[model samples]
Target chain A: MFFHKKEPIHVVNIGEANPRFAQLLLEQFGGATGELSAALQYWVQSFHVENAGIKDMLQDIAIEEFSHLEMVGKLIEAHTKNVDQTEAYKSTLFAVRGMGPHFLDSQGNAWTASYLNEGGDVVRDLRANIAAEAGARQTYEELIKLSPDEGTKQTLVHLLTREISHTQMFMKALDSLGKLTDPFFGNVQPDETVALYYNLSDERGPWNSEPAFKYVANP
Target chain B: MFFHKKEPIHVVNIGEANPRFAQLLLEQFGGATGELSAALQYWVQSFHVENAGIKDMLQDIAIEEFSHLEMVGKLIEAHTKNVDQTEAYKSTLFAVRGMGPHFLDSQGNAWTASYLNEGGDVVRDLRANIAAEAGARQTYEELIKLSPDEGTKQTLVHLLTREISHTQMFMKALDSLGKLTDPFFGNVQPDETVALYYNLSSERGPWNSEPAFKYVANP
Candidate 1:
């Protein structure tokens, strides 16, 4: 059972039709890293959560993912509805999909449980969530760039903001968990075949200069 | 370090230039379940492998994954070459991606390491591979449906077949392995209760139909 609010999470017009843009739109809709997968991953994880505080966080984000799915779906179908698919296509999408929305990545791959991991370990799952949001954020930013129309662009901007915002929440939430969850701040060499911060990762970046890392060598 | 074969795997004329097709082709190139992910997953897993027979299988599949990547890359670039994409989207693929073939999923999410799990446990990783291949096969079938051209369809068909073939090798390879790699055939019913897959699968499935599952009454 779920509750509903009187309004949509994002109140805006669906915008103009351009089946071409449907390409980008479908990514958020059905891509492996898209909101549909996000919704289901968190939803399934919620059932196995042992922590009250984190469970609620998981539920909230999972639910929001559903709303995002609706937004992306609507936009994709709107752009593609009732067009001449004479490019050897018809009913479901134009080129091949027939007409409108399907749970498919932009490349037409269906979402699968293979894209998820819910090991019943909270820390592991949260870490996965962090990575997921990072990927989603990058995807939205790139999609926003590919999308030129005004209204849709704003909608995508909101979606991207959500990915960034959710990531912060998950990162902070990771801090509240216990010792097993205590993160190793830097690479642990696993075997001491290397030197301090010796790997080739862009040393010119702020990460290389930050005092926050403490420069602690792995044990 | 990687090795390469000096040849084109799928020698066929790429069909008509349609950026719309480019949208879908990118998924096979870089989506989480696409060939690039498959290539990397097997490659990373090869380093941690313990069994000689399975390791050789992993190496062969990992190498073939590169060929599939090349085939997909060619198809995507062919569809969008020299097209009028100036909605601030011109040349190879900028505004969204600075050109064709930059390892972004169809939804524009950059390829991420999060898609992999070389847990250093042989069976665990192999099980993961089976599922990964399943996802890749479905993705190809869906992509094939979205594509109408015969040659490209045939190409995707062969890719899909490879996934099915690889799965068989991995599964049979699992048979030659030891106790650490042996998996239970069914659930371990934590307290032996309920006809449902018990922990929490949807009750709608026919998994409830058997004496073998032994409807051990709920706790």
Candidate 2:
């Protein structure tokens, strides 16, 4: 069935051929660290990103992640449908692997609302994004390993790879911004007028381990 | 003190404010519904937006939101500083108001991985944006009313006004796009090769609802 973009697909009801497998798949969907949070994190952060190019990239990625959320949700539903409630409950799988109602992880940790941390500090935010990207990649890797289904595993791998590429792109953007500074501590405030133009500086060193500059200087 | 444009203001502590108040303020700092999210939303959405004029406006507004996020964070920090351990324990503020950490709000929500919903469906997304703008404006108004400090209230009021103006511009853009469509949903998709040269229609009918077709036709 063709689903509307905004409609939340019910994935929790799909019956499992293997009850244990179904429960594991359900855990994947039920977890806070799943695709729902991933989509929301990027979707929300894109709204706050200061740089136009970065913001655009983030928006594109966020929309794509939303699609992934649907895909994962559907996968979970497909696996959970048509199972006997009594049998499912009595099985060792159901006993050990019940999914939570809210978006919680397998360990029953609830999804927290605090996601993006722009904090008005661009450098700090960029670093946070880098860290977030790394963490997401790690989660995807773990998911791929835990995924029993071939299709799910393949999809997770592809997503993990994409996360890596996205991380690189953000890194490049950060580096470009970092390189614009002519001196390590030269007036850090970016000139408001020429903020859009991209240029490299000879005297200004890379944004290495120096005391943090106040702003990006104009080229 | 006259603060430099991007000077790192070392906040030693937030003065002894109520914990609930502090948590609510943190929502303005990093919450999905805060200024950071609003900025990122507009900036990212600007790229996929068809009308050049509206797109530019969105970009400008989104950039401004980033600055607002900084201001809000500063305000939050200033209000929540330097409570002794005993005082912190005495106040049920932290326990009653659960926003994960001091940095997070009562919900522990993070910035979603994605905020852009460009499903190549401009009309649907635009409608969603209108709702988003309204919600954001309402939140701003609420913040302004709740805030006792004149500076904070004024800042929020300014943001709320801009949001209203932005919604108007987007509505206009949507109206303009709606006019180019043939009633049966035909001719809505504009060809990339064509240069648009149509005069503004006197009767504002189609552009008022969906403008994607108009954009495609003209561009």
Candidate 3:
């Protein structure tokens, strides 16, 4: 039986609220590295998964991403209350970036939809997810660096660390799936050459359930 | 008070799942078009939204996407149970698609991480989201056409219809933000644009307050 929870999960502390920080937190909410992509990546792919273990992993991760979304919302709401529009706009916070309601980075580049795609190819897709997590980790790290408050920094750091762990898990899964002889595409034979690498002797098991060959033997 | 649970929300039921359909469903689950993208798209963009109405909309949608992730998991589980090994292998299902533990499409693609990126640009992100919904809707429609079961077809149809409505809502939000001067990056003028779109004019009895410019001149 699969374990599942019905109650909503909470992440951010309710006591601390900062609008500017909340605004920044929104990046995670709707951003490419955010929960939306994480959930979709795992849940959609689970359908095609033939391996039971891998399918379970995807389901678990997708559910966790939902929690992340809640955390981001809580953080944003908390920050919003304390922020003064005049002070925030005059300070390094808003002055450093100006795109009005639409947020622009210091360099002024807009987020694009092409940032995420699940093309139905395993190796290619996993590689893409790993890269996404790396980018998300960087984004969270930057948020930590930019914030002066300890609470905000702590929150971001925790998120960043989780991203790193996620990346590692994806990598391990990819490795376990066995190597592709042709990395580009096509059916590549499993590498028996590395059988000794894991200390396994290369011999087929002697048990035979189907005995059709025994009737024709020595004839 | 903000209207909570006033509109009739559509719920799609996918019954007695088929493994083959699960393969395609994985794209939305684990792929860029799936829950991951939906979560990030709504939550991340919520940061830039100052208007209360938009904020409420984003929050609501993000939560809904979380439920979709759960649906994807349920579908996967139902399809994965009790199949004859030899028949499963010989059937067109396994012959056309190879086996793996990770979430993959029929074509053997895995989920990617690049699905989420929140750069804080509202207009650009919203436009991209609209496009994403449109594409997803198309895919759902196709799925409906391909599905032999009425239950699956009903689910796909409901999802596709919702996508159409979501696209419209995003478009409205984008229009409320302002006209885009640059199509590629979504550069636009922001002032009373959002206020005006929401009909928050100064010359009103209930909704509007005294104009600041008028007060300064008269005082």
Candidate 4:
């Protein structure tokens, strides 16, 4: 089920130790949109899917995510090493957990399994997967902006690009399903009210104005 | 590595379907301080420990956590089934993922692997585990208050009591270790500054003024 690789998928050039930056990097390492979340979510979601090709894609991407997790861990470790007791030692991360990558976000919130969005339905799961990739890509972009070192920025860029590619792959698979608009479950015919949009705001925007929804404010 | 148990560790009495209450219960199912995080954290931390006794305890708790996870899943399924298109169908959960217990918190945040706080240090990990159990116990207490069914309340109370017991077990293990005050890493003698508490706020709180820390305002 697994093969060990000595080298990281992307060669990370960690220019210097910045304990503060390491704290920020923890977000990707163990945050809601992090690689570990992406990896495990796809791995678990794969079992519920029926299509062989999509299942293969999920497993393949899950492995790739593990590799990405390793790269993130390396980046965090490089930045966190040799922290001494000073202002540097009091970094939001090191102050609590010492010089190592922790399973926490920048705010020190622990990453929960709830971050996974696998809803069992292939089409719905695929859409959630695409959103997950997009969220990670955006987070990487923000982290790049916060990066003090060019080498670290380059590594983030590589990771960001992979998110985009993964998003495309998931979108392609979702399009292939040809049932994006339909609910996968509810084998029994849905109630007519299922299509009626409960307009809490009474707005006539394209969302409510769209033909797909029969908008009713007080039904 | 796992033995499948056909029946849940705790027999759950569902009472009735309350999609809204089910959404609240998702916090315990997949939230940061939930069973899944508790299980995975202990399971991973077990590999890093040196003591066989502690390792046994970690593994034991981890397996028990899995049983609790099954109980929570059963609770969600029973509460979520048979949701129809109405206000019931538009529950924060069903509106997005249909009639099911999803890997998400009450606020719809997805669960991430980072929630597991396995710092690779036995004392630190144990303390974190204790905190996790306390957090989960509090969540279950809050959920019990919100439950519409007495049967569901009984199930939640059962889960909460287990969290209390788990906390005691973890505390016992930590006390046996006898290194709660020392840093696990820092093979070299730590810098003197490690003990100096840099008082940012100049508040003479017991935490900073405690005998363990020498309060220093300006270096």
Best-matching candidate per TM-score: 4
**Candidate 1 per-residue C-alpha lDDT over B125-178 given as tens digits, one digit per residue, 9 for 90 to 100:** 888888889888977877787674877888889989999999988788766665
| Residue pairs in clash, model 4 | A111-B114, A111-B115, A112-B111, A112-B112, A113-B111, A114-B110, A114-B111, A115-B110, A115-B111, A116-B111
Model 4 lDDT tens row, B1-219: 233434677578877688788888888877888887887688656544667899789878877886787678668877876665658658566676655666778887777765666663677789889889988998999998898889999989988999999988998887787655544442456665776787565356766776767888776
lDDT of model 4, residue B92: 63
The per-residue C-alpha lDDT of model 4 at residue A206 equals 58
Return the lDDT, model 2, position B131.
63
Best by DockQ: 4
User: Which candidate do you rate higher for DockQ, 1 or 3?
Assistant: 3
DockQ winner between 2 and 3, please give it.
3
The DockQ score of candidate 1 comes to 0.04
Q: Can you give the lDDT of residue A163 in candidate 2?
A: 70
Cα lDDT tens digits for candidate 1, A1-219: 665443557764656577777766777887877998788888888888888889999999999999898788877767776664433232223343345777777655667778776775788788888888888988898888888588889999999999888888888888766423465433444555222343432234343335433233333
Tell me the number of clashing residue pairs for each predicted model: 7, 62, 51, 10
Q: Docking category for candidate 1?
A: incorrect
List the per-model TM-score of the A chain: 0.77, 0.61, 0.65, 0.89
Candidate that scores best on lDDT: 4
List lDDT for all candidates, in order.
0.72, 0.50, 0.55, 0.75
Q: Using TM-score as the measure, what is the rank order of every candidate, best first?
A: 4, 1, 3, 2
The residue-by-residue lDDT of candidate 2 on A1-219, one tens digit each, is 001222332222332344445445433343444554554455445434557787666656655555555455455434433443656545634343232112334453444445433333345445556676776677667666767567656665766776787678667766877832322322366564432323434344334213543334454
